[PDB]
């Protein structure tokens, strides 16, 4: 069935964490 | 039959195309007087088409689905006249041309001013070179076996590695 708002916010939080890790890896590649 | 192709003699599409082309030419003809030159031209067209289609039928060409002769180039003995025989004729002519050109280049590298001989062709020299192309394959094999056909790699300019 259709996904709920709780699932939407869980996905958003997971994407935010993945973005934090991406920024960390980019800073690690920079120097 | 050699890839499901019927002979064009009993091909219904081939006859249909015959009929359509003749009918189109006759329709173009109806608008001209019988004695007029355009009428003669169109009638010559009709005769040309008829003889063309009869010739195509008489040589056992293979027509596919609808009427269109298809060429078999696998070496079949029943179709040697499509690619193998004209192919050999082409090979004889092309080898003639190339061989005589090569001979002319050879015969003008010993001249004092070869470039002038290339831009201004020595017509007598060129013609007596061209006459030698009749037996070009024999000369080619002789030069190949004697070693005068191929230059050794030690005398050919190459770029650094």
């Amino acid at each position: 069935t259709s996904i709920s708002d709780s699932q939407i916010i869980v996905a958003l939080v997971s994407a935010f964490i993945t973005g934090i890790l991406a920024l960390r890896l980019g800073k690690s590649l920079y120097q | 039959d050699v890839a499901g192709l019927t002979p064009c003699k009993e091909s219904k599409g081939f006859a249909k195309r015959q009929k359509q082309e003749i009918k189109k030419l006759e329709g173009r003809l109806k608008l001209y007087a019988p004695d007029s030159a355009p009428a003669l031209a169109i009638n010559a067209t009709i005769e040309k088409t008829k003889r063309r289609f009869e010739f195509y039928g008489n040589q056992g060409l293979l027509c596919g689905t609808d009427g269109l002769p298809h060429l078999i180039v696998d070496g079949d003995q029943a179709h040697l006249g499509e690619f193998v025989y004209p192919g050999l004729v082409f090979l004889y002519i092309a080898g003639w041309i190339g061989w005589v050109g090569r001979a002319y280049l050879i015969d003008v590298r010993t001249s004092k001013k070869p470039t002038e001989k290339e831009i201004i062709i020595d017509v007598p020299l060129a013609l007596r070179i061209m006459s030698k192309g009749l037996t070009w394959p024999v000369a080619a094999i002789g030069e190949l076996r004697s070693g005068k056909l191929v230059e050794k790699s030690s005398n050919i300019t190459v770029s650094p590695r």
């Binding site: 259709s2 996904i3 709920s4 708002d5 939407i8 | -």
Partner: protein, 34 residues
């Protein structure tokens, strides 16, 4: 769609604001003399 307002929110951001911040930051970065 579970949240119809959520496209109307996100598309403007990633379309106008994120490019604005990204290009401003990159312009400030590539014009540094150090």
């Amino acid at each position: 769609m579970t949240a119809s307002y959520l496209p109307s929110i996100f598309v403007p951001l990633i379309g106008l604001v994120f490019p604005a911040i990204t290009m401003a930051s990159l312009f400030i970065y590539i014009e540094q003399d150090e």
